[PDB]
Ligand binder design. Structure first.
Ligand code: HPA
Ligand code: HPA
Ligand code: HPA
Ligand code: HPA
Ligand code: HPA
Ligand code: HPA
Ligand SMILES: [Cl-]
Ligand SMILES: [Cl-]
Ligand SMILES: [Cl-]
Ligand SMILES: [Cl-]
Ligand SMILES: [Cl-]
Ligand SMILES: [Cl-]
Ligand SMILES: [Cl-]
Ligand SMILES: [Cl-]
Ligand SMILES: [Cl-]
Ligand SMILES: [Cl-]
Ligand SMILES: [Cl-]
Ligand SMILES: [Cl-]
Ligand SMILES: [Cl-]
Ligand SMILES: [Cl-]
Ligand SMILES: [Cl-]
Ligand SMILES: [Cl-]
Ligand SMILES: [Cl-]
Ligand SMILES: [Cl-]
Lengths: 231, 231, 231, 231, 231, 231
């Protein structure tokens, strides 16, 4: 593919998708055995290794619909990837969304025009693969990892003067990130399975930051859920 | 409320929501003990009775976003209803959606303008209550009822010259109905729990009709899931 | 048709269209001779009888664009109906619209997406059949029934947090209902004649309700205009 | 006003509004007594004279929503004009619209964004003043002038590569012009009375032109209706 | 063409485009030798003469996207015009835009729907011909004419209750007029060269008017730039 | 700032903005003296060094409106950056755009919803800083670097099933990239100066690729123009 420098078979059937390529490196080195880096193009690293003797890949996506759309499209179309699991963070937009909660996104709202480009007057509601979601849910429940299932907002503007997150929160939306709508829409359009698993990095509306310790803990829980759901 | 002639306490915390008021009558009389009809306004019947000694109501909604929106808003705001379960049918738009499958909607797409009216440039993705969905899922799995979890399309025009169901099917959408987006959006906006459970009445694209026997069978499975999930 | 259980010839060339199927029953029994009920599907009753020896039908439509669209499409396409006259009520949105006024809608505005679905960037302005409107107008004038001719708003949300009726009233719009845009657009698309005749059930902005006596009186005037215009 | 060089009282309560300022001159000189030109700014002539001893003004508007909007706004706001009657032509878009027919517009569709600018998700349907329309209708009928009442399309692009007039014609729309939506919307927003009366200059879809004789004849009928309706 | 009464070769390769046809007359008579009026249709005058022995035409456009679109389309398609230079005025919307500044528009924003009609979900950004712009820029700089290069707003409503000029000014937009988007889009679509050169007639937000002397001076500078850039 | 790990004064007044952080490293090391890396967050490298004794920074932006928007907003708001020069590539969409041409973007079209989010019914046309553009233009002309000035398309979807680049090319648009609209809109909103300078990496419509040698050559020309314009 244009943006990924891998050879055939170098990428696994299951790919984890952090936004930050340095977090892709961290995940692969920390969690997987026998790791190879299959991509260095643009420094958007991708790695493959094994978890309990099963091949797992980890590919950074960058930030925003347009950047993840590139990687997801190439993974699916050039590398025949079957399962695509974003592992990332979001800003919580409700008080009931706790800093320790691991979020499994059933769907996502968005201000990206990517679906109105395709559908015009239709509001397309992207949808997580239920089999992936349920496995992740079971995995959290089994260990007692606090988990919340609901929807998120996929934003184009991290700094948005016209943000509607107040209203989104009142409609039940849990948090704001910049990737999910693209991942869920593209995977579904190609008959692949996708899921986004998210930690909470702060509460956007109260400005209240999560501590470095809290983040390390939730990150490990997210990765454990991602992996465990998958073996 | 304006459209429902009930007194306080006459409607249960849990309401099943068929589109057809005559199917509301059928459900209440067939499945519940000690049934009272609490509403006859516009002939949109609503009933309350018990299932295993727990109060359950059944309220017809009519067809279309605008009609269900009336009933859902009044149930929530005037009767403090907590759990709202549409039990209805849809036209399947994919071959892999089988006539015996009971559909649990995680979300719904729509050509209704109801959310663009509220959100403008935002695509709002409605979201089922996961607790209700998982209970329904468990209930089906427990008995071996075939069940499929994914998304549906909420249509304004049953006869639509500009239908995009071809494209919707390619994006993974399972079927087309006329209520879900409204139910999920309104329940969520008011902090209530909603779920839509759907049988398949035909395949819209092949014109192939489900038999009367097939429909009777799936209808009973839907109601059993609706109830069982709830006790 | 899918939603109407009639046989050919059972429905007249001229059909009155109340929203409430129980009001369809009331109209047919009260005004017409030799009445037969040709439809009981979903309890959305339809009747045919005679008025001065001329066949007239009366078909409930339900509430909302999507519900009337079903009945209108089936009446036109399966039953070759020629004249379609909604007889209903609306909430007045101006002080100069009096509680006794019978409204004849020349056109209707809407927040339904049904026409943007068909036309995209075009604002489609639906249009009453002038021959039907003028006959109704003449009929009112002949008896001294107060009558106002202008436009209405066809709303998707009876309970609308984002209502623009304040601004609509300033642009001259008389009142808000939930059917007209669909009736006028569908009839015109198929070369049939349509008209909506409306009473005033309240003033939405002042909350001021019309009395039961006032409503009985205006209802009879509406029906008299509907009929008289037609014989 | 900014664009009209008249003094107070120089413009009548009733103004005829041709698009072409040279046709304004023709109308005033040909039909009215004791004519004064009250405006020469931009050569968009405006005249006042009498018809049967009643003051009538005639003001050119130019072509397009934006140009008529200027003149209509200034006439209403600076000159307290009460009745505004466009007298113009249109391209017929249906075969049943005959070259001799004088069109009275009940409403107009448009691809101008002027109402979406004000109303967003609402389709605003402009509405002729029924009193003006009925007088014009009566006036034609009295003399046997062929007259058709229905809707027109207000176009921004005389040369439109993306024209939807085919579809508009199927929905019953009679013809295409470039002014009506603005006139009807602005007059209504300010509590004034407006009407558009139109001749047919050609059939857009067949390219078939009306003869110079046909045009002279229809023009005189239009003006006669405009005037007669008004005295 | 339909709206221009000229014969072939009567219009030059280069046409100046004032909005006001009386200003077209003024420009031609004041600046050019051996002038002929080639168009009197609708009193939208067009003239051709010579400037330093080179043929130059001057064509009024009227006000608004729809009116200039007519003239520009006919000039290009029927008269094979190569260079199209609007010479007009605008209302400044920023304090830093001085009354003596001559504006060269690189692009224009708009509330016209003309490009959404063609492109739907795409924001089309029109673009001046850089060769024309640079020549005009050089011409001003050579003589010391104060000149500002940036963008303008093409408005449909001179009187706009929903104006966003406050926000437009904060994004750097210099002023508001009613023609540029159309000129730049149409010229580009047909492979011709266009440029808009504008004087400042007032500051819209402070209501502060430019004096008649200031306007005479800037007008002459605009015309000098238009001409000089061209010889 | 959240995404950039620099201290105050570490970033220059002038920042070059390649999409690829590895190209930021290449540029800084190859062209500048006394280079320090001020940012390693997410591996989106930023460097500062000197060019002819003047401080210049080079900051990778990532791909897509949302990713560059992050970096541009933080550069402006936290580091008081004055001049922002994207140096990147695009896919040419016209035959007349040659592989050796260096493109200076006056404006950009887009399918991003970022401006409709802010402006609704307004098409916002972003605008390059003319002073930056003219300096870059002069710099190319001085050395004989082939240079083309016009507009580009800022795309959200590198792989777009609904691409309108065919039509965009006919309207004169030169090429497609994924950043410019954001850079130009954000810089302008904050009173900073921006310009995008682009090489051609291929012709999207013919699939014809530029050679590695051609790309090395054009890249050096782009950087030379970027720098020279600036000293
Ligand atoms: O406000 C934000 N916008 C987008 N993504 C985010 N992730 C955390 N906060 C945000
Ligand atoms: O085509 C349809 N449209 C809406 N609802 C439906 N339910 C079954 N078929 C349909
Ligand atoms: O507010 C309303 N909305 C829609 N229809 C109505 N009919 C009376 N009031 C209303
Ligand atoms: O095609 C046209 N467009 C707009 N107005 C018209 N008037 C006659 N023909 C037309
Ligand atoms: O406010 C205005 N709108 C449009 N054009 C203008 N030219 C000067 N002022 C204006
Ligand atoms: O097709 C493309 N899309 C976006 N950016 C690009 N840069 C080169 N080609 C492309
Ligand atoms: Cl494996
Ligand atoms: Cl992330
Ligand atoms: Cl946001
Ligand atoms: Cl109970
Ligand atoms: Cl149903
Ligand atoms: Cl549909
Ligand atoms: Cl009969
Ligand atoms: Cl009704
Ligand atoms: Cl409303
Ligand atoms: Cl008088
Ligand atoms: Cl006209
Ligand atoms: Cl058109
Ligand atoms: Cl010459
Ligand atoms: Cl002008
Ligand atoms: Cl404006
Ligand atoms: Cl320095
Ligand atoms: Cl790049
Ligand atoms: Cl594209």
């Amino acid at each position: 593919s244009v943006h990924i420098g891998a050879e055939k078979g170098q990428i696994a059937d299951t790919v984890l998708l952090p936004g930050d390529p340095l977090r892709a490196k961290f995940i692969a080195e920390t969690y997987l055995e026998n790791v190879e880096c299959y991509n260095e193009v643009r420094g958007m690293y991708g790695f493959t290794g094994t978890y309990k003797g099963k091949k797992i890949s980890v590919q950074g996506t960058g930030m925003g619909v347009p950047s993840i759309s590139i990687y997801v499209n190439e993974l699916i179309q050039s590398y025949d990837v079957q399962n695509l699991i974003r592992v990332g963070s979001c800003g919580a937009i409700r008080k009931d969304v706790k800093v320790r909660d691991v979020i499994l996104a059933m769907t996502s709202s968005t201000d990206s025009q990517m679906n109105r480009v395709a559908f015009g007057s239709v509001d397309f509601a992207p949808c997580a693969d239920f089999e992936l979601l349920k496995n992740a849910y079971d995995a959290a429940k089994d260990k007692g990892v606090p988990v919340t299932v609901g929807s998120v907002f996929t934003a184009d503007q991290f700094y948005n003067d016209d943000s509607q997150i107040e209203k989104l929160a009142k409609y039940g939306v849990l948090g704001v990130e910049m990737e999910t709508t693209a991942l869920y829409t593209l995977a579904a359009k190609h008959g692949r399975k996708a899921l986004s698993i998210l930690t909470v990095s702060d509460h956007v509306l109260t400005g209240e930051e999560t501590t470095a310790e809290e983040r390390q803990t939730t990150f490990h829980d997210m990765i454990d859920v991602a992996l465990h759901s998958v073996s």
